[PDB]
Design a protein around this nucleic acid. Structure first.
Ligand code: MN
Ligand code: MN
Length: 692
DNA sequence: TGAGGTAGTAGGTTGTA
DNA sequence: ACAACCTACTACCTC
């Protein structure tokens, strides 16, 4: 029942390692000299900014004379030598893995033999290794993944009667620098560049999108391993590598958390507020009323294809909606359908979805001041000829500020299939008697979260707060910052889950410049002042503390934050959230000799921690940890971890728990929606989440 | 696009005594 | 050039 992490700390120390340093007379310095020495002398090496470090003397120098040669230790007070030693240790590990163990260096990983073969698709194993120096100690971390390839090359396809597309993606698999694009010549293009070489080298690219069906099923079955198999296969190769490595020594069992220095904490599930205290969200939603009800005016957008290509009539659509209005009335929410849709009856045909741009302008007054319930076939939404989803969002959210919920034909087909399979198909809706039986039937199957998620989307897009946290957080205000790349121009977002119980109060785009992952000083100051003013508008006071959650690495300027929060006399903390730590944590059970994972587990060391926030099934995979880093110091770090974990139970748009806290999960979605132009910055309203 | 989860693929991207 | 995150897409199973 011990706690295991994919890391190990060496018995040796950073300044106890004897190394050889060569100093020679751009960041690409002494690299060709490194390659020459590597080929000539057959020993691991590393370089950093015109300096080479080795573990053994270099006999042959290939006619190169270093300015200085030294046999010394590292200066731990200088991070330069720390980085150089880290690179040397990683290179030595790679060198020792390639020999004695038959490993290749492919891409960014180490290809490790073949594990599966699925109808001319080869699956290899692979591993990543990382070296860090923390307080005169060396820590090695490692992560196991997979790799895909096709057996046949383009040479085997030019013959045997097979064709080639003019511009399909092909791969030239070489050593560590693989690209993406008889003995016939194949002309290929990359970026803006034309070239050609032998067809035997190139192979077709292996991705999920391009693989034929009946292959994705089995590939997914192989590459979705449980906790036990993943952890065992990860530790077996590292134990194999320890035998051949002798520059550093480790413990007999280096993989526990005591040997790594972490300490263990176990958090608890917060209480949620549905007009009372509820243990879980599901319990509150099944048998409880909302925290803040109200009235909703819904409208209907129905396309004729439901009747033309499928067998769904408008009567069935209104029968489905009548079920929604009956579940909602039991939660304090009253929904009414606008009657303006009758004047535009018979519209929304194929021609309408082909000339949407011309036809939508006169359709605005019908759907004004309502929450649209679009009923569109998935073909229209997906087809690139129409692209109806993007245009609908751009014209309803990006203009006219109208919230809309989209439903495809698959949901209605599943609902109708379940309706037929349980009888009671004769009548529904009116007379308010068959609706109760329909709800009773629905409540005992898996098609209950679909209806509830549709309802939750409607509520949240129409200004309703389903529930909040029943206990206030340690801090009084949370500000979440997120950015998106989108291959060039970058859109960002600063948002407020400020309330100690959980309430959107304001959202704000970081449209101005921002280049990439950098917020201008004036922009940051103005946004912080706007956020604090927005908090002053509510609660009629100022917060005693503020916590700033940042998606990624905190690359901003701390002096401005300190000055601004000192002007208003508020304490502040800055926390980095890392959602891809590339580490795995698990509990080992010796009685059954198996691995497991528990939600709300924290491994903390110094001002860094790993948090477990999800509980996936065996066939879904193994839980992904979250890395929490504290940049400043004003509160205990355990309080920071507890607040981060608590703020993730606020997935008010879905009954399924999200891994990340609300400050990040509602910021990335907002940034993504704003980048595509589905939200206008004129309003920036509170408690409304059209993008959610 | 009912939503979440995890896990492959391809590319940015900022800092470097 | 090396590290360590980030972005986007696709696929499946769960509720
Ligand atoms: Mn994001
Ligand atoms: Mn949605």
């Amino acid at each position: 029942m011990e706690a295991y992490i994919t890391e190990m700390v060496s018995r040796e120390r950073a300044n106890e390692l004897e190394v050889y340093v060569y100093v020679f007379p751009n960041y690409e310095g002494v690299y060709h000299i490194m390659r020459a020495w590597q080929r000539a002398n057959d020993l691991p090496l590393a370089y950093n900014q015109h300096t080479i470090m080795a573990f053994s003397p270099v006999r042959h120098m290939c006619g190169y004379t270093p300015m200085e040669t030294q046999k010394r230790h590292i200066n731990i007070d200088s991070p330069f030598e720390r980085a150089l030693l880290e690179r040397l240790i990683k290179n030595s590990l790679i060198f020792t893995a390639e020999r004695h163990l038959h490993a290749k260096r492919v891409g960014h990983a180490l290809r490790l033999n073949q594990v599966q073969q699925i109808r001319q698709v080869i699956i290899y194993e692979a591993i990543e290794l990382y070296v860090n120096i923390i307080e005169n100690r060396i820590s090695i971390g490692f992560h196991l993944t997979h790799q895909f390839e096709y057996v046949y090359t383009l040479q085997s396809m030019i013959e045997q009667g097979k064709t080639i597309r003019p511009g399909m993606r092909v791969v030239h698999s070489n050593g560590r620098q693989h690209y993406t694009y008889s003995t016939r010549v194949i002309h290929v293009r990359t970026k803006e560049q034309r070239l050609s070489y032998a067809a035997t080298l190139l192979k077709p690219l292996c991705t999920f999108e391009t693989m034929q069906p009946q292959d994705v099923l089995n590939v997914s079955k192989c590459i979705k391993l449980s906790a036990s198999k993943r952890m065992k296969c990860t530790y077996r190769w590292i134990q194999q590598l320890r035998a051949q490595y002798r520059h550093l020594t480790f413990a007999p069992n280096p993989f526990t958390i005591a040997q790594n220095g972490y300490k263990l904490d176990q958090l608890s599930t917060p209480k949620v507020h549905f007009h009372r205290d509820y243990a879980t969200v599901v319990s509150g939603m099944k048998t409880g009323k909302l925290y803040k009800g109200g009235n909703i005016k819904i409208s209907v957008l129905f396309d004729e294809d439901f009747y033309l290509k499928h067998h769904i009539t408008k009567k069935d659509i209104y029968q489905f909606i009548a079920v929604l209005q009956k579940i909602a009335i039991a939660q304090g929410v009253n929904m009414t359908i606008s009657t303006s849709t009758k004047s535009i009856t018979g519209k929304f045909t194929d021609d309408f979805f082909h000339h949407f741009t011309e036809e939508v302008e006169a359709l605005q007054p019908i759907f004004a001041q309502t929450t649209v319930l679009a009923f569109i076939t998935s073909t229209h939404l997906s087809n690139k000829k129409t692209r109806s989803y993007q245009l609908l969002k751009q014209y309803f959210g990006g203009k006219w500020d109208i919230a809309s919920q989209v439903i495809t034909e698959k949901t209605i087909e599943a609902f109708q299939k379940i309706l037929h399979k349980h009888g009671l198909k004769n009548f529904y809706p009116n007379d308010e008697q068959h609706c109760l039986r329909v709800i009773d039937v629905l409540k005992n199957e898996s098609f209950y979260y679909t209806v509830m998620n549709i309802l939750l989307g409607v509520y949240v897009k129409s200004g309703i707060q389903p529930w909040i946290l029943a206990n206030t957080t340690h801090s009084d205000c949370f500000i979440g910052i997120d950015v998106s790349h989108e291959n060039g121009n970058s859109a960002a977002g600063m948002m407020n889950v400020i309330g100690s119980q959980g309430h959107l109060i304001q959202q704000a785009p970081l449209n101005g410049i921002l280049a990439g992952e950098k917020i201008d000083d004036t922009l940051l100051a103005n946004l912080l002042k706007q956020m604090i003013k927005a908090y002053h508008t509510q609660f009629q006071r100022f917060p005693k503390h503020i916590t700033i959650h940042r998606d990624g690495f905190w690359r901003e300027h701390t002096a401005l934050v300190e000055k601004i929060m000192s002007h208003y006399e508020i304490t502040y903390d800055i926390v980095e959230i890392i959602k891809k730590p590339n580490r795995r944590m698990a509990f080992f059970n010796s009685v059954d000799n198996t691995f497991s994972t528990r939600q709300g587990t924290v491994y903390q060391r110094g001002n860094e921690a790993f948090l477990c926030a999800t509980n996936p099934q065996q066939k879904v995979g193994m839980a992904q940890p979250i890395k929490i880093h504290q940049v400043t110091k004003t509160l205990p770090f355990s309080h920071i971890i507890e607040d981060v974990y608590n703020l993730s139970f606020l997935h008010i748009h879905a009954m399924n728990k999200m891994r990340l806290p609300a400050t990040i999960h509602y910021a990335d979605l907002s940034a993504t929606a704003y980048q595509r132009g589905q939200v206008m910055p004129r309003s920036g309203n509170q408690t409304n989440l059209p993008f959610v």
